[PDB]
Amino acid sequence: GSHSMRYFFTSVSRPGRGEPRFIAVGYVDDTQFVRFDSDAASQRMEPRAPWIEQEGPEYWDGETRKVKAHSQTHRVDLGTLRGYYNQSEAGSHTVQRMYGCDVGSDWRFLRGYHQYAYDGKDYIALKEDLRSWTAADMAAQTTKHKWEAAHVAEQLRAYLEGTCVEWLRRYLENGKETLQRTDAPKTHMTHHAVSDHEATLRCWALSFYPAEITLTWQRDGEDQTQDTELVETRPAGDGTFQKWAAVVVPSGQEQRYTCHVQHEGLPKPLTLRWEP
Amino acid sequence: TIADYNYKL
Amino acid sequence: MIQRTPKIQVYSRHPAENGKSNFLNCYVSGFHPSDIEVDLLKNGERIEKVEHSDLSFSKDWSFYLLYYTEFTPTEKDEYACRVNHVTLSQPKIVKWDRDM
Ligand code: NA
Ligand SMILES: [Zn+2]
């Protein structure tokens, strides 16, 4: 199937004392595999998946040097941005950056992205062409002119189309056992009386991977959105995900309702009904 | 692997 | 700056069975800024050995974290998640309900 490698970086300034709090995390699909936390003891990029631990010391030294360079760029950025927005030296502010690459079923480059945010709002983003920039406001327009002059998009396009995709293929091979395994949702239905004549039916999808899934209710074969509740997909904490969808029904009419589950791990979508 | 790139905001 | 209040889900890693060892999760998401206070409570008292995931964020830039600890569901004990954030006037307590 399709795959992605994504890195997420957050820095939060601490005006009272010291340098910004910095957290970097790397993912292959929905699996976290590396992390860096400026508050952690190691001061190194750390493994978070068994398949990355086999990488040699030149790998770890290189990733540590680059992630510490990212933290310093963010520290400088927080200063520049405070100036662009005429903000006080007293408030805490945040910079977020995410970049990465997607590959198709053939494991060839599909798309790349690089987005930057200041105080939780879009600041500057590389366009899908990997050549152009989307600047949200006039401060970002100043950055865009500097990035054009400094060949930033060319350096990113070379990384996203080359290095990013090459290492993603390497990780998918080394971590085959889990990364290329799809875990279809384990599904069941629960019934919760809300009175002596109505009940909630809850359709559960557990222990699935990747996180992408669709749970939909139907009544007599037509989609039902009235009296439904769908929770956001959530992590189980063991690398898999969970979700549920519920509908309130008149008691005795449960057989009209069907829950439909779509997931990459299912060749054909599942249909569940309440078993009285 | 993370990017090795340079930029100034 | 934009201030987005956390969405909170409190749930178990596995279907709950009274007397059977499990893991209590508090998933906080959709919030900004990232500073947040999350405690897991047993009978209104703070649980001490609580761990959390590494800070990450969604497409809209809002943050998410998972706080978790081992627990054993029982008929008598009440579990909950207590969250405080700059967007909240008082900490928000969400009780664990094994049906959700
Ligand atoms: Na390579
Ligand atoms: Zn009624």
Notable characteristics:
heterotrimer; A: 276 residues; alpha+beta; 2 domains; eight-stranded antiparallel beta sheet; five-stranded antiparallel beta sheet; 4 helices; 17 strands; 24% helix; C: 100 residues; mainly beta; four-stranded antiparallel beta sheet; elongated; binds sodium ion; binds zinc ion
Write the layout of secondary structure elements.
The complex is a heterotrimer of chains A (276), B (9) and C (100).
Chain A: E1 3-12, E2 21-28, E3 31-37, E4 46-47, H1 57-84, E5 94-103, E6 109-118, E7 121-126, E8 133-135, H2 138-149, H3 152-174, H4 176-179, E9 186-193, E10 198-208, E11 214-219, E12 222-224, E13 228-230, E14 234-235, E15 241-250, E16 257-262, E17 270-272
Antiparallel strand pairs in A: 1-2, 1-5, 2-3, 3-4, 5-6, 6-7, 7-8, 9-10, 10-15, 11-12, 11-16, 13-15, 14-15, 16-17
Chain B: no helix or strand
Chain C: E1 7-12, E2 22-31, E3 37-42, E4 45-46, E5 51-52, E6 56-57, E7 63-71, E8 79-84, E9 92-95
Residues 166-167, 170 of chain A line the site of sodium ion (NA).
Please characterize this protein's 3D structure:
Chain A has helices at residues 57-84, 138-149, 152-174, 176-179, and strands at residues 3-12, 21-28, 31-37, 46-47, 94-103, 109-118, 121-126, 133-135, 186-193, 198-208, 214-219, 222-224, 228-230, 234-235, 241-250, 257-262, 270-272. Chain A is of the alpha+beta class and 276 residues long. Chain A has 2 domains: 1-181, no CATH class; 182-270, no CATH class. An 8-stranded antiparallel β-sheet of chain A has the order 4-3-2-1-5-6-7-8, covered by helices on one side. In chain A, strands 9, 10, 13, 14 and 15 form a 5-stranded antiparallel β-sheet that branches. The longest helix of chain A is centred in the N-terminal third of the chain and has 28 residues, at 57-84. In chain C, the strands form 2 sheets. In chain C, strands 1, 2, 5, 6 and 7 form a 5-stranded antiparallel β-sheet that branches. The N and C termini of chain C lie far apart (34 Å). Chain C is mostly beta strands. The chains are: A alpha+beta (276), B little secondary structure (9), C mainly beta (100). Bound molecules: sodium ion and zinc ion (ZN). Chain A: Residues 185-271 form the Ig-like domain. Chain A: It is a single-pass membrane protein; Single-pass type I membrane protein. Chain A: One of its GO terms (molecular function) is metal ion binding. Chain A: This is HLA class I antigen.
